[PDB]
Paper text:
The abundant Hsp70-type chaperone [name] (or [name]) is a central component of the chaperone repertoire of the endoplasmic reticulum – the gateway to the secretory pathway of eukaryotic cells. When the burden of unfolded proteins in the ER declines, the ER-localized enzyme FICD (or HYPE) uses ATP to transfer adenosine monophosphate (AMP) onto the hydroxyl side chain of a single residue within [name], threonine 518 (T518). The data presented above reveal that [name] biases [name]’s conformational equilibrium towards an ATP bound-like, domain-docked state that is predicted to weaken substrate binding.
Furthermore, their L7,8 loop regions appeared more disordered than surrounding parts of the SBDβ (indicated by higher B-factors). These findings indicate that the bulky modification favored solvent exposure of loop L7,8 and prevented T518 from forming intramolecular contacts observed in structures of unmodified [name] or other Hsp70s. The substrate-binding domain of [name] apo [name] is found in a conformation typical of ATP-bound Hsp70/[name] and its widened substrate binding groove likely underlies the destabilizing effect of [name] on substrate binding. In the structures presented here the modified T518 side chain was flipped outward and pointed into the solvent. This suggests that the bulky and hydrophilic AMP moiety sterically prevents loop L7,8 from reverting to its ADP-bound position.
Numbering used by the authors: 28 to 547
């Protein structure tokens, strides 16, 4: 059938389709070309998704869920998760060492949701938007992720798709999708393109070559917990302390108060893109009293300057890894909602010595546009030809060797799909199991990198130490996801080598439990 492209964003999501030669961003049932990544459950038992969920946040905050993308594929003890909890109105609890979301679903029934199930509900809304527009069932999709998403975060996003009833044919990196929207129908030789993607939750920078429909990522770097949400948090913080200094009251108590301030901070940020002052006004803020303050552009910039300035470091890194200088960059493409902030535009322009970014790119829609194009390439119904994409892995994959040392296996910025083999043996006589720990990151010791998984090679036949010869193959697929397999290569009595792991990701059984649910 028809394959759609869905930009699943931290705060807003967007769906498009590429067919009959052209790209069409699809408007939702309220006429909006983007949909808030919000889900809500009313006291009466009704589930809301999108605009309807966001517009009742301030009256039903405990049972309104959002920012699931900053929770997805992480652990409960993650310092990033514990930071966000302070500003979210819904209960986040530990389960299987992951953060799960607890709400009342209506008729006083408590339920606990994985972050994947929340994102699945958002995907279900985007799928129904496309189904209405096209007048047929949509079972196939391309879905986006930040370029710097790790292995667990990627897989978790695919699982969300599966829970939504979608066959996710491809996971495309957000900056690559944005580059497609820019470069589609450029016919002017090889160009070096830098994409600067600062959204509602994640930050990516990617350097690409684009040449008459052939797209190739050279280098990428970013931060998966840096975006609009962090800028909003710094401003919310400033006003919670300000209110406490004026009245002696801690609004951290009342969830309505905190989320009323969120709603107003969002509007004030938007206004500060085209004016230098904005009024924060809340009727019935805390215990009936109202809130009335002004935020200047200078104060907003003051509160976030460290975060804004930190976006320049990943830019320096991709130039160093690509072996290119500033003057080699032919075009700068800004995408993501936070690139509308004037200070972000100034920093980028000053870093590239006065160079203007490209016009004709809507930063909220450009990623969905390219996602739609990649979707069409994978269907005979929609494929025009003249579209070749080569992407890379964002993180160095290595194995833990003796002393907690990171031994590199596949370096960062290697084109995918790719694979690498290594032979392992045993350390003692008749050892039945060999354990391998895979890590993601650039630091020399595994303690300072991120653990992808602990893999056990079981069923190793009895032999003296050092005799067995097990070839383990590590394959990163086109989606950027790792698969590990093992073969016995010995000169003797062999066996099937079975691999188990310690990874916390969802099994098809659990997905089937969730897919055979959510009709409630």
């Amino acid at each position: 059938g028809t394959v759609v492209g869905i930009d699943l964003g931290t705060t807003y999501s967007c769906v498009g389709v590429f067919k009959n030669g052209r790209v069409e961003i699809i408007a939702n049932d309220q006429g909006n070309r983007i949909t808030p990544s919000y889900v809500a459950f009313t006291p009466e038992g009704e589930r809301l998704i999108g605009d309807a969920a966001k517009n009742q946040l301030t009256s039903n905050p405990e049972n309104t869920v959002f920012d699931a993308k900053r929770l997805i594929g992480r652990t409960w003890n993650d310092p990033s998760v514990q930071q966000d909890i302070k500003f979210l109105p819904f209960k986040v609890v530990e389960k299987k060492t992951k953060p799960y979301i607890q709400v009342d679903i209506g008729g006083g029934q408590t339920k606990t949701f994985a972050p994947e199930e929340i994102s699945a509900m958002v995907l279900t809304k985007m799928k129904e938007t496309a189904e209405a527009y096209l007048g047929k069932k949509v079972t196939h999709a391309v879905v986006t992720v930040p370029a710097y998403f790790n292995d667990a975060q990627r897989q978790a996003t695919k699982d969300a798709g599966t829970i939504a009833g979608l066959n996710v044919m491809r996971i495309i990196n957000e900056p690559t999708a944005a580059a497609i929207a820019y470069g589609l129908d450029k016919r002017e030789g090889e160009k070096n393109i830098l994409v600067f993607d600062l959204g509602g939750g994640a930050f990516d920078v990617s350097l690409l070559t684009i040449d008459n429909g052939v797209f190739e990522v050279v280098a990428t770097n970013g931060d998966t917990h840096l975006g609009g949400e962090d800028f909003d948090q710094r401003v919310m913080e400033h006003f919670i302390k300000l209110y406490k200094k004026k009245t002696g009251k801690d609004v951290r108590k009342d969830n309505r108060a905190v989320q009323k301030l969120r709603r107003e901070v969002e509007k004030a940020k938007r206004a500060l893109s085209s004016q230098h002052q904005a009024r924060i006004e809340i009727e019935s803020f805390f215990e009936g009293e109202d809130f009335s303050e002004t935020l200047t552009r200078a104060k907003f910039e003051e509160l976030n300057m460290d975060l804004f300035r930190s976006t320049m470091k990943p830019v320096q890194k991709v130039l160093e890894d690509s072996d290119l200088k500033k003057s080699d960059i032919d075009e700068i493409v800004l995408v993501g909602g936070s690139t509308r902030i004037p200070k972000i535009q100034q920093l980028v322009k000053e870093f590239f010595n006065g160079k203007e970014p490209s016009r004709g790119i809507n930063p909220d829609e450009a990623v969905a546009y390219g996602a739609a194009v990649q979707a069409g390439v994978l269907s005979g119904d929609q494929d025009t030809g003249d579209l070749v994409l080569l992407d890379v892995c964002p993180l160095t994959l290595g194995i833990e060797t003796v002393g907690g040392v990171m031994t590199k296996l596949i370096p960062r910025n290697t084109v995918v799909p790719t694979k690498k083999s290594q032979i392992f043996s045993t350390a003692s006589d008749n050892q039945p199991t060999v354990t391998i720990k895979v890590y993601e990151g650039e630091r020399p010791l595994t303690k300072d990198n991120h653990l992808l998984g602990t893999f056990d090679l079981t069923g190793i036949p009895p032999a003296p130490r050092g005799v067995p010869q097990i070839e383990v193959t590590f394959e990163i697929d086109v989606n950027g996801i790792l698969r590990v397999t093992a073969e016995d290569k010995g000169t003797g009595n062999k066996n099937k080598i079975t691999i188990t792991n310690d990874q916390n990701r969802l099994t098809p059984e659990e997905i089937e439990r969730m897919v055979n649910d959510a009709e409630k």
